[PDB]
Nucleic acid binder design. Structure first.
Lengths: 305, 333, 333
RNA sequence: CUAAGAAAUUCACGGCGGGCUUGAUGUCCGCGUCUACCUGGUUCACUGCCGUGUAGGCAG
């Protein structure tokens, strides 16, 4: 939750077959926890050989397409699946379902490290995108060159550099590279605001956002409600459901050096915004913040409003 | 030493979806603004042509069952009626670092596994697996039914470093056979590029383009969605075809299935063709699993006896196991 | 030995959608720039002319039904007012390898099936089947109702090797009867070409163009689409015709139904002409199935007797079974 | 170190047959668009231009 000394625009990334499930109660764009884990993976595998510190991530999502279908008379939708290989006797496999989608996202990476003065900006940008072109972002492959990968160069920009006119000018020159984009932010305080509004009957927060991504048809003495924005339900972190265990206690863990607790994820709210409506760009970035003695592990955009 | 209860390998040779677009042959050198192939819909009034269950075989039920026929909506992709060539273009990337698991419990098992893999790689390179991969790119396995009965297939591969073409190839997918992995100088050059990529030694990004002259207006075969829930048999669509944006395309998992077809070492016959590299190596079209665990050629058996118990297999089964580690997989107990 | 639980053959004789265009006879040779036949709309009101179920046969209810509006919108395709010739152009591939399945569980079954089909192709060609298929291209079966009442039909078939014509035929579809598989010289040349395609001995691609002289402004008949019924007041559309990018068209499977109407060997008659090759060969217009399974000339009975139990049937029924394998289909249980 | 790591939906098919959309009709009345202006490099350190060749008589 440090303030960023720079911003890094991974400019245009086609994602091949990402995970469009995101939670047990959503299905659209993937969870922003995947983006936080991606930028932390870049912090691991190249972010220490350049003496930098990559924390924030700004989601943009230019173009979206999911592999769904509505089944011919039904009003809801289903997912398109894949054939898995056959069983041991070659009979058939038990089908689990996974939603798959195609993203075209752009990433804004906050940089904090002391190596911003030791290295030229283009070398930092080139090595970051050349590493990120061999990784994956929501369980989905990050696609190489296509018919129109002309904005291939990454760009780096220090937000502190220059005068106030210079900072805001270079900001609005960055926003010309987010052209059909729609940034995703967290709007937790609006969830508590509407809960304090309609908390006459039931102050359960599940009912609140379960009555916000909707059209609310009120009747004659029809006055359907007005949408304040593109409010959509998001998953917003994890809450524990078990006492934490030692690194050797839990059977079949991913390793034997980290403690494991069984958790439950923790639903939230946020809404998609154009990159003109935001004031600056340092307020737009996602950060992971955990309270480990309790079970509150979450991510948000701190210092947005 | 026991096995790791969690074993997971990430895939190398990660392909994309292959978009399909159409135009005329001998203008394929400038095939950059060719229009795409669009999925459309058409109607199908079918008829009853199934095997009956020897109890519903009376003439009255047959007549009364072809009174009310079978009416369907399918998806079809076709060439335009003045274009005879199918351009199928996708990008393959070769990652490298193929012995390192992506999730492993036991740190001793991972050390023994990486010693085993580096012992393989120093005793013999990735040359055999990359020349078999170079074959399955050099002919046109990824054109599945789009290859059958075409008269001229040309494959163009471009290695890409930056916004520029590092090296170009132009193969002939019908001279390069479908069965006998014959050697070639250009196949050896492209195979050395793939084997440099698979060993973590370079940045290998291919661009695979194949042209198939089939005929003006003929039918092409994009891949087909797996849909379980459909409507109430009246308005339902029995055949959906895959499409990324307004263009009929092939899934990436079956192009990767085409690249993986290497396995000429399963104990039935190499005369019946190479199959796809799988554990329990099984063919969905055949409906039958070759390489049973009741024999000893299964991937689990070979990997456990070559990592834990140091019963090193034959060299060909080593090629099979490293092909599985290149494939990926979520193994374990 | 038993049948495989999965058999699947891919179709040979793989045609394209025929597209319709119109112009003047004896400009027929320059029919390359002829404008398309556009599917159009007009309005229709009809009267009550179906049968009545004797409880709507009261006179006052009938007169109240006649005073009711009965409107709806239909699609029509006509020639222009200064064009009297319909041009119908499709293409056709003959593939060959016409007994090899594409999805077969039982490996012993497909071995004995390939032995049987290879025995057939050894002692007989594809000569009778290509003779009959080249008849159904030589006349104009693929002009379904467009041929009915035309005063002059002719067919122009061009074999295509590259973007170039190898050989051109020109027939007279009204002299070549709809019934008699007669003898001719150029028709035997086309039968040799189609038999070399079915045997696997060459690349066969045809450009089948047919000109029907109909009359100025008369109606042509694209194949009709499939719409769902609702209760819309004052007329929802009651008829949709098939089209491509603004050009009336025939489905590819309807042309393919015309080309495999070669079956004169069914137990009912052969003065009734050929019916189409179907398992238990059924006509949908006549609503009954010729070649019932209980009178054992069904495709499944003949194939079970001839592959599993070596009972070779009569020569003509062997032509029928191989015609079903050239047809393709979803076989097995 | 990302609800992490893996993935072939396949084959085949005839939408057809018919049809009268009609009858009738008032679009009317009224109006301020003004006020002001340099297309002036050589529309080429050049088209026809002793040598196309940093040398020259060159509608300069």
């Amino acid at each position: 939750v440090t303030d960023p000394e720079a911003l890094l625009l991974l400019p245009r990334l086609s994602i091949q077959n990402a995970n469009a499930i995101s939670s047990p109660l959503t299905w659209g764009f993937p969870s922003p926890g995947a983006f936080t884990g991606f930028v932390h993976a870049l912090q691991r595998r190249v972010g220490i050989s350049l003496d930098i510190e990559l924390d924030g991530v700004g989601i943009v999502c230019h173009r979206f397409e999911a592999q769904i279908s509505q089944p011919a008379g039904k009003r809801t939708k289903v997912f398109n699946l894949t054939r898995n290989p056959l069983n041991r006797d070659g009979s058939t496999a038990a089908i689990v379902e996974e939603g798959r989608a195609h993203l075209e996202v752009s990433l804004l990476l906050g940089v904090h490290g002391d190596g911003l003065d030791d290295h030229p900006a283009q070398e930092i940008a080139r090595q970051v995108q050349e590493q990120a072109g061999a990784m994956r972002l929501a369980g989905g492959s990050i696609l190489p060159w296509c018919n129109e990968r002309f904005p291939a160069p990454n760009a780096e920009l220090l937000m502190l550099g220059g005068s106030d006119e210079q900072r805001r000018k270079n900001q609005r020159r960055l926003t010309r590279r987010l052209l059909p984009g729609f940034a995703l932010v967290s709007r937790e305080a609006l969830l508590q605001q509407h809960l304090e509004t309609l908390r006459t009957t039931l102050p359960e927060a599940t009912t609140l956002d379960a009555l916000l991504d909707l059209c609310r048809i009120n009747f004659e003495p029809w006055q359907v409600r007005d949408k304040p924005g593109w409010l959509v339900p998001i998953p917003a972190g994890y809450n524990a459901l078990s006492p934490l265990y030692l690194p050797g206690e839990v059977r079949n863990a991913r390793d034997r050096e980290t403690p494991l607790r069984f958790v439950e994820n923790l639903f939230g709210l946020g809404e998609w915004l154009s990159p003109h409506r935001v004031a600056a760009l340092s307020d737009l970035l996602w950060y992971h913040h955990a309270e480990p003695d309790k079970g509150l592990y979450r991510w948000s955009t701190p210092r947005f409003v | 030493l026991s096995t790791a209860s969690v074993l997971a390998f990430e895939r190398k040779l990660d392909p994309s979806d292959a978009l399909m677009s159409a135009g005329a042959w001998a203008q394929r050198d400038a095939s950059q603004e060719w229009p795409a192939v669009t999925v459309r819909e058409k109607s199908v009034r079918g008829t009853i042509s199934n095997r009956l269950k020897t109890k519903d075989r009376d003439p009255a039920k047959l007549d009364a069952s072809i009174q009310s026929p079978n009416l369907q909506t399918v998806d079809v992709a076709n060439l335009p009626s003045d274009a005879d060539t199918l351009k199928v273009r996708f990008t393959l990337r070769v990652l490298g670092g193929a012995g390192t698991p992506s999730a492993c419990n036991d740190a001793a098992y991972r050390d023994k596994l990486l010693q085993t893999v580096a012992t393989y790689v120093n005793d013999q390179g990735f040359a055999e697996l990359a020349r078999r991969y170079a074959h399955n790119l050099a002919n046109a396995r990824f054109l599945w039914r789009n290859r059958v009965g075409a008269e001229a297939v040309e494959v163009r591969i471009n290695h890409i470093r930056q916004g520029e073409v590092a090296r170009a190839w132009r193969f002939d997918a019908l001279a390069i056979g479908l069965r006998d992995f014959k050697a070639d100088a250009e196949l050896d050059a492209l195979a050395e590029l793939i084997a440099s990529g698979l060993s973590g030694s370079g940045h290998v990004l291919l661009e695979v383009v194949a042209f198939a002259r089939i005929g003006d207006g003929q039918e092409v075969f994009p891949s087909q969605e797996l849909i379980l829930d459909k409507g109430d048999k009246k308005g339902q669509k029995s055949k959906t075809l895959y499409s990324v944006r307004d263009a009929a395309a092939i899934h990436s998992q079956k192009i990767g299935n085409a690249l993986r077809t290497i396995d000429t070492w399963y104990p039935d016959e190499d005369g019946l063709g190479p199959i796809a590299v799988e554990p329990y190596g099984s063919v969905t079209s055949q409906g039958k699993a070759y390489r049973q665990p009741k024999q000893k050629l299964d991937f689990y058996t070979l990997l456990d006896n070559w990592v834990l118990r140091d019963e090193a297999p034959a060299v060909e089964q080593q090629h099979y196991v490293i092909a599985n580690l290149i494939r990926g997989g979520v193994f374990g107990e």
